[PDB]
Amino acid sequence: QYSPNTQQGRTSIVHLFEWRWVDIALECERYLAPKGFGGVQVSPPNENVAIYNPFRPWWERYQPVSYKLCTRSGNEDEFRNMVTRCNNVGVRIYVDAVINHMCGNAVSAGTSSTCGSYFNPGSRDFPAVPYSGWDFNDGKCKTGSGDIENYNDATQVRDCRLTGLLDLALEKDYVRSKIAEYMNHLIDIGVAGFRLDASKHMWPGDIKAILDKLHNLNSNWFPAGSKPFIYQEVIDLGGEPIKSSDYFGNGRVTEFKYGAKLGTVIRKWNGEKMSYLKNWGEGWGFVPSDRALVFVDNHDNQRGHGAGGASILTFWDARLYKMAVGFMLAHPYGFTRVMSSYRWPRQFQNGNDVNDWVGPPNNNGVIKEVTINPDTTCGNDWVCEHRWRQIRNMVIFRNVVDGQPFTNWYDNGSNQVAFGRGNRGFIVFNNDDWSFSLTLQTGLPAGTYCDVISGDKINGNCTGIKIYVSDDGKAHFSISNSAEDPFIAIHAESKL
Numbered sequence: 395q396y397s398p399n400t401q402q403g404r405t406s407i408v409h410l411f412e413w414r415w416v417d418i419a420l421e422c423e424r425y426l427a428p429k430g431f432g433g434v435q436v437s438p439p440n441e442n443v444a445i446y447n448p449f450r451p452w453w454e455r456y457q458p459v460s461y462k463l464c465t466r467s468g469n470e471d472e473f474r475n476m477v478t479r480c481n482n483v484g485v486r487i488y489v490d491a492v493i494n495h496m497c498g499n500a501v502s503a504g505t506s507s508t509c510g511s512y513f514n515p516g517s518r519d520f521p522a523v524p525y526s527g528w529d530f531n532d533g534k535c536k537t538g539s540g541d542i543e544n545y546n547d548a549t550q551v552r553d554c555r556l557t558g559l560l561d562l563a564l565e566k567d568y569v570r571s572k573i574a575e576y577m578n579h580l581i582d583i584g585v586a587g588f589r590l591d592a593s594k595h596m597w598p599g600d601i602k603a604i605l606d607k608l609h610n611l612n613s614n615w616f617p618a619g620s621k622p623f624i625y626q627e628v629i630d631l632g633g634e635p636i637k638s639s640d641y642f643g644n645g646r647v648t649e650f651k652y653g654a655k656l657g658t659v660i661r662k663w664n665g666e667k668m669s670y671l672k673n674w675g676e677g678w679g680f681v682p683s684d685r686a687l688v689f690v691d692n693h694d695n696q697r698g699h700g701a702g703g704a705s706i707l708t709f710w711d712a713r714l715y716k717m718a719v720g721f722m723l724a725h726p727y728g729f730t731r732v733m734s735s736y737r738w739p740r741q742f743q744n745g746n747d748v749n750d751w752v753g754p755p756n757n758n759g760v761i762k763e764v765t766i767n768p769d770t771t772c773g774n775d776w777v778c779e780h781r782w783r784q785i786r787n788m789v790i791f792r793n794v795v796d797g798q799p800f801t802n803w804y805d806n807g808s809n810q811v812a813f814g815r816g817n818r819g820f821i822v823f824n825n826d827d828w829s830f831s832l833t834l835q836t837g838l839p840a841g842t843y844c845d846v847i848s849g850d851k852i853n854g855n856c857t858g859i860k861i862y863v864s865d866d867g868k869a870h871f872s873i874s875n876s877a878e879d880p881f882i883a884i885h886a887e888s889k890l
């Protein structure tokens with residue numbers, strides 16, 4: 395459950411947040427496969443509650459009504475079509491599995507679901523699955539309100555409602571089987587793994603019992619004995635009774651300290667500086683690298699809806715964001731996930747975005763298609779960070795330097811650092827308020843290299859900065875603190 399199951403050479407997955415299945419299928423063929431992306435995190439593919447007040451928010455998808463593959467992203471046929479086409483070009487699909495709960499208890503009964511399924515939160519009836527009052531933790535939760543009230547009590551965190559979401563009794567074999575039935579349907583369709591949403595709110599043992607019921611990956615695309623990739627969403631920062639290490643036996647875990655600390659370092663908050671990143675990784679108290687799923691931001695915290703809070707960097711902070719993503723993709727620690735978002739009208743009031751609920755670009759609730767502009771950027775308000783030259787090229791950089799050791803580190807005791815990956819890559823950063831101009835040892839073979847941040851290597855020449863590495867491996871780098879992108883990266887494949 396620890397291996398991503400990506401094909402040899404591809405080292406990152408991208409979260410195509412709220413994208414339609416048909417757009418993802420196309421993206422796999424026209425961009426993801428050609429550019430070397432390993433896979434895609436898709437939004438929950440199962441039927442959810444259609445919420446109209448506010449108008450179709452992104453979070454309505456974390457509020458399940460049934461396990462029918464029918465949502466605003468498409469129907470079951472379109473979903474299957476997407477998985478098949480993506481797999482055919484070597485790009486894996488990972489499903490966001492919302493299995494800790496069903497919808498909010500206050501939600502009105504009726505057929506206001508993305509597929510018309512009937513449900514009644516009040517009486518605990520979800521006939522489409524089916525689930526009844528016997529399948530929820532109502533009688534088990536001991537809090538006066540029925541919701542989680544204290545996170546210092548590990549029992550309550552697991553058995554009570556996360557902000558009202560009806561909590562499934564995961565210890566019952568019936569419930570475990572209905573969930574496995576759902577997941578095995580997806581595995582047999584061809585998905586390579588799952589993101590287990592809100593794993594902190596589930597007992598490690600209940601998760602294990604469910605995973606024991608899972609099939610091996612589809613033998614038409616994967617080698618026999620392939621187990622699904624499992625990454626657990628567990629927000630573990632400062633001391634809480636629950637630790638992310640309690641979930642290592644089930645698969646990988648999201649390391650939220652990664653994005654939070656990288657954000658404060660790049661923003662230079664609290665007197666932190668890039669020179670401190672010398673021992674980035676486990677040395678900073680993070681989980682072991684082989685159990686970590688890392689990222690700069692995710693769909694929750696990019697809109698202040700989660701762990702990391704104010705320090706989190708997003709596409710809104712373009713310049714610093716690219717630098718953070720650059721550092722992440724170049725550093726050997728963990729398995730990396732790139733974010734791909736959509737724009738929403740941020741409107742801050744007293745320090746809080748009152749429009750953090752806004753769902754994906756749409757026309758009367760119907761999600762808009764991702765349009766590709768002549769310069770490969772996207773239209774219809776999709777940000778497509780994964781298409782930004784700076785990020786796309788660093789995704790490739792990671793593939794090229796895969797397996798190569800962290801070495802040749804340099805720092806000026808402040809905010810301009812550099813390091814290489816074996817003899818396959820080298821990257822330099824200038825985050826100080828003054829220019830950087832120095833000759834550094836790169837460990838790369840002599841030659842002329844194209845800087846992949848400022849440009850590309852297009853048929854025999856570089857469209858941007860060019861770096862010259864001598865016989866002894868040294869090379870001169872000059873980065874003005876005024877540069878559009880204050881960092882340079884070169885690798886074995888950008889060499890002329």
Ligand SMILES: *[C@@H]1O[C@H](CO)[C@@H](O)[C@H](O)[C@H]1NC(C)=O
Pocket residue numbers: 853854855
């Ligand atoms: C690189 O570009 C120059 C013109 O700027 C041209 O003279 C040269 O032949 C090009 N090299 C290749 C390999 O295309």
Ligand SMILES: [Ca+2]
Pocket residue numbers: 494551552553554561562595596
């Ligand atoms: Ca629970």
